[PDB]
Amino acid sequence: HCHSGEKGANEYAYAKWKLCSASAICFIFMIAEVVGGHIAGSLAVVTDAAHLLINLTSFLLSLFSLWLSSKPPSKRLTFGWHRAEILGALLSILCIWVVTGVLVYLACERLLYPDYQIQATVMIIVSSCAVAANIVLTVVLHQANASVRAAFVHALGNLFQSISVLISALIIYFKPEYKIADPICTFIFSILVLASTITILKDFSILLMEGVPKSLNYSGVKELILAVDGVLSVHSLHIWSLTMNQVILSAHVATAASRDSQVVRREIAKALSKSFTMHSLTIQMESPVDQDPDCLFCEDPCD
Amino acid sequence: HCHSGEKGANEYAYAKWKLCSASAICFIFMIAEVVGGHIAGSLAVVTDAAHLLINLTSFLLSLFSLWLSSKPPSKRLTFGWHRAEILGALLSILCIWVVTGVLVYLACERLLYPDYQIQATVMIIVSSCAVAANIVLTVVLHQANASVRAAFVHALGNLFQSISVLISALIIYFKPEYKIADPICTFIFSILVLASTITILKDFSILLMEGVPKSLNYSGVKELILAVDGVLSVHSLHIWSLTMNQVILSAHVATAASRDSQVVRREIAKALSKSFTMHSLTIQMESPVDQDPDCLFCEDPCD
Ligand SMILES: [Zn+2]
Ligand SMILES: [Zn+2]
Ligand SMILES: [Zn+2]
Secondary structure: OOOOOOOOHHHHHHHHHHHHHHHHHHHHHHHHHHHHHHOOOOOOOHHHHHHHHHHHHHHHHHHHHHHHHHOOOOOOOOOOOOOHHHHHHHHHHHHHHHHHHHHHHHHHHHHHOOOOOOOOOHHHHHHHHHHHHHHHHHHHOOOOOHHHHHHHHHHHHHHHHHHHHHHHHHHHHHOOOOOOHHHHHHHHHHHHHHHHHHHHHHHHHHHHOOOOOOOOOHHHHHHHHHOOOOEEEEEEEEOOEOOOOOEEEEEEEEEOOOOOHHHHHHHHHHHHHHHOOOOEEEEOOEOOOOOHHHHHHHOOOOO | OOOOOOOOHHHHHHHHHHHHHHHHHHHHHHHHHHHHHHOOOOOOOHHHHHHHHHHHHHHHHHHHHHHHHHOOOOOOOOOOOOOHHHHHHHHHHHHHHHHHHHHHHHHHHHHHOOOOOOOOOHHHHHHHHHHHHHHHHHHHOOOOOHHHHHHHHHHHHHHHHHHHHHHHHHHHHHOOOOOOHHHHHHHHHHHHHHHHHHHHHHHHHHHHOOOOOOOOOHHHHHHHHHOOOOEEEEEEEEOOEOOOOOEEEEEEEEEOOOOOHHHHHHHHHHHHHHHOOOOEEEEOOEOOOOOHHHHHHHOOOOO
16 A cells, blocks of 8 residues: 554654753753842853853754644645754754854954953853853753754854863963963864864755765665566666655666566565665656667766 | 656756856946045945945855756765755845844944944945946846846845935935934835845745745646546645756556556656646556555645
8 A cells, every 4th residue: 555654753752852851951051140140240141141042042943843843744845844854953053153153253353352351260160150051951962853963063062162261261360461362262163163063064955955865875775676576677766855764765667567567666665665764655667668878867876 | 758858958058147247247346336445535335345245245156056056966966956056045045134134233233322423425325326236236137047036135135225325324414413214224124125035035945845836736736637537546746846947746646457557657747747847757656456544644735
């Protein structure tokens, strides 16, 4: 019948906790260490307490993306609302890029305006919690689902940014004669952030461009299909992916003309669903006749 | 043979001119009206001459997206590099959102710091060219290809932003007693920008989520297919789209068991390619047997 029905359902549920819990943890931390600013110096933690609101924002946005992904397939969005996950993830990552650019420009400003001073010891304790809080905010998002993996890279990034004042603070406190080791620290650590976002960006860009999923390999799939009896030649094998774990596949095959078709494609479906989980298959089951010199449109992926 | 080979090839060529020409026009304008700043007041046009560089940047980025779209299909990117167009377009539009947010924040700053003054007559002539130049930069991008349509919305947006100082300038010159009609102008006109970007964003988001293309209609396609003789029931009709004009389709059909299959799907392909151009079709041609009460996974798009 070519439609097979808890292994997937439960996973949407786990992340839903791995985010709501992390969002709540960041909520607690932001609340506490902002009320610890009104009842003390009022320009102490707000600047750090800022970032925490950004992380919370990204976490709630990723959770919103999950809730969207839950929605059922419609007439307009046929396959379902799945890629909403990847979309929210890519939006969050571009927001990392934007926020980091903003921070780098403010660092350059502080450089061009060295007329500024901050007590280099209380500057550390405020950094330590920010590092510690980020340590916790990361280890909960330790990968997975495109949504959580987008929140982790978003969290880890803050960690490098978080120490980027601590490791700077110590160098300021232990030798305030320098005063210009902080901007270079923000620079290099923003670059580290950007490297991690480069990894995730490459992966989700390959996803959005209907690229074959990393988890698989095209020529391996052609071998795996052609390794079945009745077939003679498989042309136009396209295999893209939905968010992460919904691999689709669509192929033309040319089988033994006098052979019964439907058993051949049934066997192909069994072989494929045996090697790896699917989400749909539409094998066209063409005939022996094919205009081979003209199949250049479906000769093979050049690569 | 199910593979049919100048109607499409020439279109990549037209836009390639509709961008390179517009990029060059903006290049000319920026050059001229920046050298008209060194040889006069040096804080006159640079701020306007700034956004021209942003428009040029977006135009060259869209052209880069086109050049990517030209690349052939590979083993990793099976369908081809097509959606690179949509990706570059969405990036450019999010950059519109970012730049407009930046401008709105600087407007709020000018508000909270009314300690500032600018001659309200020379402020107009610098605005008029910016409006005129934007008038020209837009009417060349008058739509189409996802790349150009992304450059037009990007250009038109600057127009509203461009007059957003002129219409402000006049009100400053004709009554400098007000001095606070400029921020509200930037506000409302940024909102207009954001509305246009909302339209384009909705469309390309529907595209990226494998939504059926606007140009078509699902139930219309089911009627158009089921209107052919041999078929009995079509389930799991998925029809997404590549960038704009590469519509794909993939369907299971259940036809008369004793009937010859391949003629049925050949006729379906003829009917579809008759109603509207395609880019691929993989009709599975299932049998009469189907487990109807269990097809809930392929019952129909709820909507
Ligand atoms: Zn062919
Ligand atoms: Zn089916
Ligand atoms: Zn079914």
